[PDB]
């Protein structure tokens, strides 16, 4: 529906290339922007499914990084004040996060800058 689907590879050399290309973009986003990929994944997940309230449960489900790293990312991002969030809410499932409609200017702007670096990197590397 939205966003170009990723084309599947069917042999070793294509896999290797895909990984090489993905690793380069990952390291760049981290180098510049100084942010872990899990923080990146949480941030883009939030941007895709716009909301005011998110269940840390769902986020962890829709991502593939294991709670330890995810919660670790939510935590940091929370301090950076990308979204309030706050732990300790007892019973039910666990934790939830709050995305102030204005902290979203902070996120989508960060993601807009990453989108610009991505197209620049595509023009660059092109190995």
Rank residues 16 and 86 by Cβ distance to its own copies and give the closer one: 16
Number of residues that bind its own copies (CB under 8 A): 41
Query: Is residue 88 a known part of a binding site?
Result: no
Residue 67 is a binding residue for its own copies (CB under 8 A): no
Please state, as a whole number, how many other Cβ atoms lie within 10 Å of the Cβ of residue 6: 8
* Interface with its own copies (CB under 8 A), residue from 1, 12, 53, 92: 12
Q: How buried is 120 (Cβ within 10 angstroms: 0-12 exposed, 13-18 middle, 19+ buried)?
A: exposed
Name the nearest CA neighbour of 46 among 38, 90, 66, 122. Answer: 38
22 binds its own copies (CB under 8 A): yes
**Which pair of tokens denotes residue 112?**
């807009």
Phi, psi angles (nearest 5°) of residue 97: -130, 150
* Angle subtended at Cα 99 by Cα 87 and Cα 63, rounded to the nearest 5 degrees: 70
Candidates 5, 7, 8, 11: give the one binding Ca ion (CB under 5 A): 11
| Interacting span for Ca ion (CB under 5 A) from 8-16, 51-59, 102-110, 112-120 | 8-16
Min dist CB 118 to its own copies, Å, is 6
Q: Could you tell me the two tokens for 2?
A: 């939205």
Q: For binding to its own copies (CB under 8 A), which residues are involved?
A: 2-26, 29, 37, 40-41, 43-45, 47-48, 64, 111, 114-115, 118-119, 122
């Amino acid at each position: 529906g939205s966003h170009m689907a990723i084309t599947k590879i069917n042999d070793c050399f294509e896999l290797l290339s895909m990984v090489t290309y993905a690793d380069k973009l990952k390291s760049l986003i981290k180098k510049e922007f100084s942010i872990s990929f899990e923080e990146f994944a949480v941030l883009t997940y939030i941007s895709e499914n716009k909301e005011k309230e998110y269940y840390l449960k769902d986020i962890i489900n829709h991502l593939n990084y294991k709670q330890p790293q995810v919660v670790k990312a939510v935590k940091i991002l929370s301090q950076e004040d990308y979204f309030d969030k706050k732990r300790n809410e007892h019973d039910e499932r666990t934790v939830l996060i709050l995305v102030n409609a204005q902290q979203r200017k902070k996120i989508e702007s960060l993601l807009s800058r990453v989108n610009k670096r991505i197209t620049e990197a595509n023009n660059e590397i092109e190995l």
